[PDB]
Amino acid sequence: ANLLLQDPFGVLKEYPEKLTHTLEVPVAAVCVKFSPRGDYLAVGCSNGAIIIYDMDSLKPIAMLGTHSGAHTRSVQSVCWSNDGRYLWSSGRDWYAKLWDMTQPTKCFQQYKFDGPLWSCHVVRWNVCIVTVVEEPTAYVLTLTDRQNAFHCFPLLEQDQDISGHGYTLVACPHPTIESIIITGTSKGWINAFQLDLEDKIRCCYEEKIANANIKQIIISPSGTRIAINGSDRTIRQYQLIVEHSVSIELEHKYQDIINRLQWNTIFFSNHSGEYLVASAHGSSAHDLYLWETSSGSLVRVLEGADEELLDIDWNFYSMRIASNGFESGWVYMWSIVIPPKWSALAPDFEEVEENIDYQEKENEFDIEEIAIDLCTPEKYDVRGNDISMPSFVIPIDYEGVIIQQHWA
Amino acid sequence: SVPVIPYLDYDIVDLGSDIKKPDFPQLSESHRINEQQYYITEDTPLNKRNFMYQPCAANLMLDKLKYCGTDYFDKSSINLMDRSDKLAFSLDDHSVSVSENCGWRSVRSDVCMKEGKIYWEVEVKNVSDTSHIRCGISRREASTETPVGCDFYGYSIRDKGLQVIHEGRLHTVLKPHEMQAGDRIGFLLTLPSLQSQSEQAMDYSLKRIQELNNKFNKEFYKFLLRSCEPTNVVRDQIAIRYKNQLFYESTDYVKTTKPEYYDNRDDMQKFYELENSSFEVFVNGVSHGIAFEGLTPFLPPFSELQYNEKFYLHHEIRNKYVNNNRLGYYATLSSFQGGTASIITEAMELKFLPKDVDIKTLNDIYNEQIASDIVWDLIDEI
């Protein structure tokens, strides 16, 4: 990342404000997930496609669902790996396909489910927690040394009941521990699940906060903040104390006092989650929201769209917000603009915003061997990211690129 | 086309009315340097658009002129017309001082230096590491807001090292000795006679007419250098009221180029220099050598007045290169962000006087400035 080393005077924002692209995808979508860098956008399409977009020219590079394992019904959620090498894709065709972009059209291993799905979440790049509909445990499916033995590990102790709590509908893994899995029931209660990666699990944390269908549980990437989106009109951000041993406490409540809308998806900021977004549900709510997660106030509104926005994604490198406007189907996208600079025309210009009163000096009437290193890559960008991991570049299709003038 | 302007209520003054005849440049608090309070001039007009301003008195004795020349101050000192707006002075030491964030300005002193040996000393009251002072010489042609040493209408002295200034250059031709908090500068200024200037005046008169002159019509510009007489004056100095009080719209010269007359012997451009000029400083009364033998001979043909090229050529009409009682080099003093220096007039305040025979202060020539300016306009009364 060297464009942000040259773009500003040194001030770069912490949320995008304007919206500069729009992916003209006429068949609608359900989920939009970026890569672990800003390059590739996986689009969970409505009919059963996945139209993966290169985020430099707004025209695709592949389609997962050509050779083997195409989704017949809709595709619900998707995640990516640590490096961006694989794809774990949950759909409504009763199928969870682990794809790999080494063979960028063929699946590797599937599972015929007992019914449809809601979501998926990966802990390692192979193991993936899925939300089987109408199931009070989470059959997390792991790709083992053999691919075939998808061990349907029931995410529940053998004695523990969530009778009166419904089914488990959300499971999101912890960032910093990588072994305690927070799940939320269909009626109120929140469990924790310490997977041993053997198969002993401990129900360390159980509770009930409020009786609702928990649509979504997110954790901040510093492992501090955890936000809960119920089926009623509230967002409860909580603080996470995991040394295992877990207890949460109420930080803030975010509601829409005017229209009383439901919040579809919520997402946090990059470092410690200093900003919470949401997308409302009802019509005439045309805009993503922001909130300062400490003070609680509505601080900014991403007023760019014309429709209701369903899903969301915030990659932290390109600082974009991708979101499918659910009515038309098009992927709205926000980006931090950089205005141009004439200061780089000659090596000394200056763009001062005011008529400066320069003092009059005397001069107006008068008439190496530093250390040089060439070997190391960069270590930290201007954003302060995990950079110096050269990512899995998705190779373009060098099996049939010669064909692509003739007939797709 | 216009008539002369009559007298007003402050013009005809009673016996016991000791009011002063032009209105005083009134004092107002600017800054506090050298532990003194320096003061500005508020409502007076200042020299702009290549013009100047001068006090007049409502003289009653003449018919054609109802106004003739006069001055404010009894002895010489800084003239109030060449002044900035953020420049301050005092009645204690008469030092010029711009403000603490103000820039490079300058003020001339009104002595009109044409011929003879004239000498005056310049007090260097204060200098800092951030403050600079350029005391020197400049003409009536050169203006006040630029620090002098910008052109050949004036030469000044650098603050540290005394690098003698000419067209922005810094020549170290004298003995270098820097100013301090108790220093003084004495300009031993040898000018040759007015007869010596008058024969250089015909030298530019006779060599601009027809030697190199073969524009479309240049005989009418030849005619103004034909009738280019060595002392003779075509003055347009009229009286105007301004900020309820009486002043002058006196004409001022416009900026010109280098006079390079081709002597056939030198096989190159030859320059007009005076008859053995001498530019010596007295830093605490020691001889420092001679910087400038090349002060210019200037009076009719080297400075061009405010003259009209299109209104006036169709026709009575004045001449381009003439004289007046205001032409000469002037006692100049510049300041930079508050570099305080004073001009010193009379021999009782002179501390380091040379043994000379022709030591002439300002006030000999300043009294001659009072006595000639009336009788230069007593030929105007006919």
mmCIF file with all atom_site columns, N, CA, C and O in Angstrom, chain A residues 357-367, chain B residues 103-105 134 146-147 168-170 336-337:
data_model
loop_
_atom_site.group_PDB
_atom_site.id
_atom_site.type_symbol
_atom_site.label_atom_id
_atom_site.label_alt_id
_atom_site.label_comp_id
_atom_site.label_asym_id
_atom_site.label_entity_id
_atom_site.label_seq_id
_atom_site.pdbx_PDB_ins_code
_atom_site.Cartn_x
_atom_site.Cartn_y
_atom_site.Cartn_z
_atom_site.occupancy
_atom_site.B_iso_or_equiv
_atom_site.pdbx_formal_charge
_atom_site.auth_seq_id
_atom_site.auth_comp_id
_atom_site.auth_asym_id
_atom_site.auth_atom_id
_atom_site.pdbx_PDB_model_num
ATOM 1  N N  . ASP A 1 357 ? -0.119 36.146 4.912  1.00 0.00 ? 357 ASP A N  1
ATOM 2  C CA . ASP A 1 357 ? 0.681  37.362 5.029  1.00 0.00 ? 357 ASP A CA 1
ATOM 3  C C  . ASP A 1 357 ? 2.127  36.991 5.363  1.00 0.00 ? 357 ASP A C  1
ATOM 4  O O  . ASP A 1 357 ? 2.556  36.972 6.517  1.00 0.00 ? 357 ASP A O  1
ATOM 5  N N  . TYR A 1 358 ? 2.868  36.674 4.300  1.00 0.00 ? 358 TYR A N  1
ATOM 6  C CA . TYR A 1 358 ? 4.273  36.304 4.412  1.00 0.00 ? 358 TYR A CA 1
ATOM 7  C C  . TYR A 1 358 ? 5.105  37.507 4.827  1.00 0.00 ? 358 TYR A C  1
ATOM 8  O O  . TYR A 1 358 ? 5.002  38.582 4.233  1.00 0.00 ? 358 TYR A O  1
ATOM 9  N N  . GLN A 1 359 ? 5.917  37.324 5.866  1.00 0.00 ? 359 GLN A N  1
ATOM 10 C CA . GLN A 1 359 ? 6.764  38.400 6.358  1.00 0.00 ? 359 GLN A CA 1
ATOM 11 C C  . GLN A 1 359 ? 7.933  38.632 5.407  1.00 0.00 ? 359 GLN A C  1
ATOM 12 O O  . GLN A 1 359 ? 8.365  37.732 4.686  1.00 0.00 ? 359 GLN A O  1
ATOM 13 N N  . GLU A 1 360 ? 8.433  39.859 5.401  1.00 0.00 ? 360 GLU A N  1
ATOM 14 C CA . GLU A 1 360 ? 9.389  40.293 4.388  1.00 0.00 ? 360 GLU A CA 1
ATOM 15 C C  . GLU A 1 360 ? 10.798 40.172 4.950  1.00 0.00 ? 360 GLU A C  1
ATOM 16 O O  . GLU A 1 360 ? 11.188 40.922 5.846  1.00 0.00 ? 360 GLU A O  1
ATOM 17 N N  . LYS A 1 361 ? 11.569 39.229 4.421  1.00 0.00 ? 361 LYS A N  1
ATOM 18 C CA . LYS A 1 361 ? 12.908 38.973 4.920  1.00 0.00 ? 361 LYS A CA 1
ATOM 19 C C  . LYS A 1 361 ? 13.954 39.767 4.136  1.00 0.00 ? 361 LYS A C  1
ATOM 20 O O  . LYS A 1 361 ? 13.641 40.569 3.255  1.00 0.00 ? 361 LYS A O  1
ATOM 21 N N  . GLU A 1 362 ? 15.223 39.529 4.479  1.00 0.00 ? 362 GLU A N  1
ATOM 22 C CA . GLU A 1 362 ? 16.322 40.286 3.885  1.00 0.00 ? 362 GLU A CA 1
ATOM 23 C C  . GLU A 1 362 ? 16.663 39.769 2.491  1.00 0.00 ? 362 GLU A C  1
ATOM 24 O O  . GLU A 1 362 ? 17.159 40.526 1.647  1.00 0.00 ? 362 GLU A O  1
ATOM 25 N N  . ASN A 1 363 ? 16.363 38.492 2.226  1.00 0.00 ? 363 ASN A N  1
ATOM 26 C CA . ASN A 1 363 ? 16.874 37.766 1.064  1.00 0.00 ? 363 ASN A CA 1
ATOM 27 C C  . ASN A 1 363 ? 16.299 38.267 -0.261 1.00 0.00 ? 363 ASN A C  1
ATOM 28 O O  . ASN A 1 363 ? 16.920 38.058 -1.311 1.00 0.00 ? 363 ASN A O  1
ATOM 29 N N  . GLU A 1 364 ? 15.171 38.985 -0.221 1.00 0.00 ? 364 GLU A N  1
ATOM 30 C CA . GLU A 1 364 ? 14.416 39.364 -1.414 1.00 0.00 ? 364 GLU A CA 1
ATOM 31 C C  . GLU A 1 364 ? 15.137 40.366 -2.307 1.00 0.00 ? 364 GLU A C  1
ATOM 32 O O  . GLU A 1 364 ? 14.776 40.506 -3.481 1.00 0.00 ? 364 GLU A O  1
ATOM 33 N N  . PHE A 1 365 ? 16.136 41.071 -1.783 1.00 0.00 ? 365 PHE A N  1
ATOM 34 C CA . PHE A 1 365 ? 16.886 42.037 -2.562 1.00 0.00 ? 365 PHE A CA 1
ATOM 35 C C  . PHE A 1 365 ? 18.328 41.622 -2.799 1.00 0.00 ? 365 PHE A C  1
ATOM 36 O O  . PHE A 1 365 ? 19.046 42.331 -3.511 1.00 0.00 ? 365 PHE A O  1
ATOM 37 N N  . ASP A 1 366 ? 18.771 40.504 -2.232 1.00 0.00 ? 366 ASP A N  1
ATOM 38 C CA . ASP A 1 366 ? 20.082 39.974 -2.572 1.00 0.00 ? 366 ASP A CA 1
ATOM 39 C C  . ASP A 1 366 ? 20.030 39.304 -3.939 1.00 0.00 ? 366 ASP A C  1
ATOM 40 O O  . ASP A 1 366 ? 18.972 38.876 -4.406 1.00 0.00 ? 366 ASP A O  1
ATOM 41 N N  . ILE A 1 367 ? 21.185 39.220 -4.588 1.00 0.00 ? 367 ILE A N  1
ATOM 42 C CA . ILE A 1 367 ? 21.245 38.686 -5.941 1.00 0.00 ? 367 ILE A CA 1
ATOM 43 C C  . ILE A 1 367 ? 21.781 37.260 -5.938 1.00 0.00 ? 367 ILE A C  1
ATOM 44 O O  . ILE A 1 367 ? 22.386 36.814 -4.963 1.00 0.00 ? 367 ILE A O  1
ATOM 45 N N  . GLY B 2 103 ? 8.108  45.240 7.432  1.00 0.00 ? 103 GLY B N  1
ATOM 46 C CA . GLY B 2 103 ? 9.169  44.841 6.537  1.00 0.00 ? 103 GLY B CA 1
ATOM 47 C C  . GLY B 2 103 ? 10.172 45.945 6.259  1.00 0.00 ? 103 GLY B C  1
ATOM 48 O O  . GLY B 2 103 ? 10.299 46.926 6.992  1.00 0.00 ? 103 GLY B O  1
ATOM 49 N N  . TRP B 2 104 ? 10.895 45.762 5.159  1.00 0.00 ? 104 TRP B N  1
ATOM 50 C CA . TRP B 2 104 ? 11.980 46.637 4.742  1.00 0.00 ? 104 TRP B CA 1
ATOM 51 C C  . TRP B 2 104 ? 11.477 47.957 4.169  1.00 0.00 ? 104 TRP B C  1
ATOM 52 O O  . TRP B 2 104 ? 11.051 47.997 3.013  1.00 0.00 ? 104 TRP B O  1
ATOM 53 N N  . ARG B 2 105 ? 11.526 49.042 4.947  1.00 0.00 ? 105 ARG B N  1
ATOM 54 C CA . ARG B 2 105 ? 11.166 50.363 4.434  1.00 0.00 ? 105 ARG B CA 1
ATOM 55 C C  . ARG B 2 105 ? 12.334 51.332 4.570  1.00 0.00 ? 105 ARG B C  1
ATOM 56 O O  . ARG B 2 105 ? 13.411 50.939 5.029  1.00 0.00 ? 105 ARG B O  1
ATOM 57 N N  . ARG B 2 134 ? 19.947 49.961 6.964  1.00 0.00 ? 134 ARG B N  1
ATOM 58 C CA . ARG B 2 134 ? 20.688 50.353 5.766  1.00 0.00 ? 134 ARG B CA 1
ATOM 59 C C  . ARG B 2 134 ? 20.630 51.866 5.588  1.00 0.00 ? 134 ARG B C  1
ATOM 60 O O  . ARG B 2 134 ? 19.818 52.370 4.808  1.00 0.00 ? 134 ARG B O  1
ATOM 61 N N  . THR B 2 146 ? 10.721 50.969 -0.893 1.00 0.00 ? 146 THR B N  1
ATOM 62 C CA . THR B 2 146 ? 11.821 50.074 -1.201 1.00 0.00 ? 146 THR B CA 1
ATOM 63 C C  . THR B 2 146 ? 13.041 50.461 -0.369 1.00 0.00 ? 146 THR B C  1
ATOM 64 O O  . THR B 2 146 ? 13.333 51.654 -0.223 1.00 0.00 ? 146 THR B O  1
ATOM 65 N N  . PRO B 2 147 ? 13.744 49.492 0.221  1.00 0.00 ? 147 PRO B N  1
ATOM 66 C CA . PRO B 2 147 ? 15.068 49.791 0.778  1.00 0.00 ? 147 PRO B CA 1
ATOM 67 C C  . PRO B 2 147 ? 16.041 50.130 -0.340 1.00 0.00 ? 147 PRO B C  1
ATOM 68 O O  . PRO B 2 147 ? 16.086 49.457 -1.373 1.00 0.00 ? 147 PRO B O  1
ATOM 69 N N  . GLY B 2 168 ? 21.146 46.161 -5.638 1.00 0.00 ? 168 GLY B N  1
ATOM 70 C CA . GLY B 2 168 ? 20.987 44.884 -4.973 1.00 0.00 ? 168 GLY B CA 1
ATOM 71 C C  . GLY B 2 168 ? 22.264 44.114 -4.724 1.00 0.00 ? 168 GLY B C  1
ATOM 72 O O  . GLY B 2 168 ? 22.218 43.084 -4.042 1.00 0.00 ? 168 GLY B O  1
ATOM 73 N N  . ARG B 2 169 ? 23.401 44.572 -5.248 1.00 0.00 ? 169 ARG B N  1
ATOM 74 C CA . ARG B 2 169 ? 24.672 43.904 -5.009 1.00 0.00 ? 169 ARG B CA 1
ATOM 75 C C  . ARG B 2 169 ? 25.295 44.400 -3.712 1.00 0.00 ? 169 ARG B C  1
ATOM 76 O O  . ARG B 2 169 ? 24.926 45.450 -3.188 1.00 0.00 ? 169 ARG B O  1
ATOM 77 N N  . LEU B 2 170 ? 26.248 43.628 -3.196 1.00 0.00 ? 170 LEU B N  1
ATOM 78 C CA . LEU B 2 170 ? 26.876 43.904 -1.906 1.00 0.00 ? 170 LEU B CA 1
ATOM 79 C C  . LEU B 2 170 ? 28.393 43.907 -2.085 1.00 0.00 ? 170 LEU B C  1
ATOM 80 O O  . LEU B 2 170 ? 29.035 42.854 -2.031 1.00 0.00 ? 170 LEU B O  1
ATOM 81 N N  . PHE B 2 336 ? 14.511 47.735 9.226  1.00 0.00 ? 336 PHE B N  1
ATOM 82 C CA . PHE B 2 336 ? 14.059 46.369 8.966  1.00 0.00 ? 336 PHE B CA 1
ATOM 83 C C  . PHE B 2 336 ? 13.582 45.761 10.275 1.00 0.00 ? 336 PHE B C  1
ATOM 84 O O  . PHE B 2 336 ? 14.406 45.467 11.148 1.00 0.00 ? 336 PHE B O  1
ATOM 85 N N  . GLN B 2 337 ? 12.260 45.587 10.394 1.00 0.00 ? 337 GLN B N  1
ATOM 86 C CA . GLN B 2 337 ? 11.551 45.006 11.540 1.00 0.00 ? 337 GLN B CA 1
ATOM 87 C C  . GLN B 2 337 ? 11.827 45.727 12.858 1.00 0.00 ? 337 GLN B C  1
ATOM 88 O O  . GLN B 2 337 ? 11.757 45.111 13.926 1.00 0.00 ? 337 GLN B O  1
#
